Design a protein around this ligand. Structure first.
Ligand code: HEM
Ligand code: HEM
Ligand code: HEM
Ligand code: HEM
Lengths: 146, 141, 141, 146
């Protein structure tokens, strides 16, 4: 993915302010709440019956932390997401068989979380820069299907 | 389907938008044009730069249509029938584009309504916009 | 929306399928499993190899549901309500998967009905399957 | 895109039987008929008001011939569709701004045309092989968006 200097700046500055122990869980929990078919892949996580149970689920929060970790790594290798994501592409595509559209969905839910967390600071140009990043990460995670 | 809880959640959140309806409609459009450049081609007679009176005026129209859908949520197909014919028949708007604008509307609401944009309300709004989008693309099925 | 012409086209084409309904339902499922491997995960208790009695039996169920939709085309949401709850709530079938099976059903019909699969009938069938798919994913909105 | 020998065989053999002066127009015309928003990009083609006008439109038939030509070229360079398709990606993405989902749609409509034309010969395994090809072509045409 190619971000202009202007966009790299937008992305990096916002990211340095992200609570990395919390934001991932907020995005994963919202993905499970808003697009409930994704819960199919998380049966071992326990109670996902209501939004409160999902958001307060310890495993959702821990797993989200790993997901955010992967986005952080991608933000650091925007020029080789394919390589950065090979192992994870193999897991999500070859092993779990997650349809790649859900990669786009999780990226958009993360964008919604960032907007909710940063408010006015998440301006339209900053959002545009993040859309390029999440589309980049989604395409790399789907490499094993291409 | 939109459940009773979803209708309440949407009316509540939209209720907090208030006089800001049109401004948020315009911000959503701008976020859409910047984030998904392919959508700009539908608006040749519009200058899409920030502060554009046309995008501001059009944001008010989009908000008014969403407001009409909220107000007649149980009769959405009928309420948005003319808008459905316009976007599908005349404008030939690609169905994918409704998902894009719906996403930008959620982002705009999340950015302006911190207290209201809970996971439950986020889900209701997503379902509401999905329903609006289904109706707007129905003159394709 | 499904227009009068579309309803006629679908009833006509489905009419030619005849005793082959279940066989075509099974062939569509097989084409789906081979072409879009991700869909196989919904069927763990099924052997999906060619000639499988389970895929044959399940193809008959899919055909019977489509036939019910054709027969009550003006009341599809009600007719497929229980099937809608099953696929969305219990099975958690990804919405994208309905587009995949719909495509395989069109391919199967095109491969068996050369005279009937005209561009106009192809369009009506696509709209019919899109409508069935909308209903089946409605317990998500 | 990686096809097994078995699939390369399936694809190449069927393709050698395709009427290349006709099949492209049948796929493009059906794309315009079945997913009518695509007509937005073909205003200069004239009468597209009914299915008969679309299918019998001389320009639809001529344009489809070019489209089929591109698929033929791709079938010959399955190991560099990105390169084979660079110029066309630039046209469809940078110039016309066609949403890439329509690339997937045109590929699936071509698959429907092949099934209609070959009937039983277009078996489930042959279809699977062609789905890999059209997904490959669609991903390459969308490269300029990635
Ligand atoms: C861009 C989006 C995504 C990213 C960055 C991502 C990242 C990750 C990471 C880092 C792990 C842990 C890997 C490890 O244990 O070494 C993981 C696991 C997992 N992910 Fe994702 N993921 C994404 C989307 C999805 C989606 C959409 C689903 C399905 C709804 C999904 C389902 C799973 C499952 C089931 C596991 C557990 C694998 C196991 O431990 O056996 N992921 N993901
Ligand atoms: C939530 C979804 C949407 C709503 C509620 C909505 C609403 C509206 C309304 C109320 C109008 C004005 C109609 C009139 O003047 O009578 C309009 C016009 C228009 N819309 Fe949308 N719309 C939506 C999505 C889209 C999308 C996704 C696109 C394309 C990317 C689009 C493109 C257009 C265009 C090109 C016009 C005409 C502008 C002009 O020529 O003046 N709309 N829309
Ligand atoms: C045109 C669309 C579809 C129709 C008409 C349809 C119809 C049906 C019917 C009639 C049943 C049997 C219900 C019963 O036993 O009461 C069923 C079951 C099922 N369907 Fe579908 N279906 C469709 C699409 C899908 C898709 C796209 C998937 C997933 C890829 C799917 C996965 C399943 C599964 C996993 C079962 C349960 C099988 C079992 O455990 O015995 N269906 N469907
Ligand atoms: C995988 C799918 C596709 C392939 C292989 C393909 C291939 C081609 C080729 C070979 C040309 C002629 C280029 C030249 O004149 O040098 C062309 C032109 C064109 N295509 Fe496509 N195309 C695809 C999909 C689409 C879609 C989905 C649309 C929009 C609905 C579209 C719209 C156009 C337009 C408008 C032109 C005319 C460009 C001009 O002459 O100014 N194409 N395409």
């Amino acid at each position: 993915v190619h971000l202009t200097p202007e966009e790299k700046s937008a992305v990096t500055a916002l990211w340095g302010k992200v609570n990395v122990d919390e934001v991932g869980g907020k995005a994963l929990g919202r993905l499970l709440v808003v697009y409930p078919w994704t819960q199919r892949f998380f049966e071992s996580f326990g109670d996902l019956s209501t939004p409160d149970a999902v958001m307060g689920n310890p495993k959702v929060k821990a797993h989200g932390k790993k997901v955010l970790g992967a986005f952080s790594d991608g933000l650091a290798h925007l020029d080789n997401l394919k390589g950065t994501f090979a192992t994870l592409s193999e897991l999500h595509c070859d092993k779990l068989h997650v349809d790649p559209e859900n990669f786009r969905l999780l990226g958009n839910v993360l964008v919604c979380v960032l907007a909710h967390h940063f408010g006015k600071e998440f301006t339209p140009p900053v959002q545009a820069a993040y859309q390029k990043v999440v589309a980049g990460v989604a395409n790399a995670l789907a490499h094993k299907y291409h | 389907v939109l459940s009773p809880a979803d209708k309440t959640n949407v009316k509540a959140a939209w209720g907090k938008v208030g006089a800001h309806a049109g401004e948020y409609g315009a911000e959503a459009l701008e976020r859409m044009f910047l984030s998904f450049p392919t959508t700009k081609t539908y608006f040749p007679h519009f200058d899409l730069s920030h502060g554009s009176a046309q995008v501001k005026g059009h944001g008010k129209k989009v908000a008014d249509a969403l407001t009409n859908a909220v107000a007649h949520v149980d009769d959405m197909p009928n309420a948005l029938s003319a808008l459905s014919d316009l976007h599908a028949h005349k404008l030939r708007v690609d169905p994918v584009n409704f998902k894009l604008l719906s996403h930008c509307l959620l982002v705009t609401l999340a950015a302006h309504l911190p207290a209201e944009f809970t996971p439950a309300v986020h889900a209701s709004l997503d379902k509401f916009l999905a329903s609006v989008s289904t109706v707007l693309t129905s003159k394709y099925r």
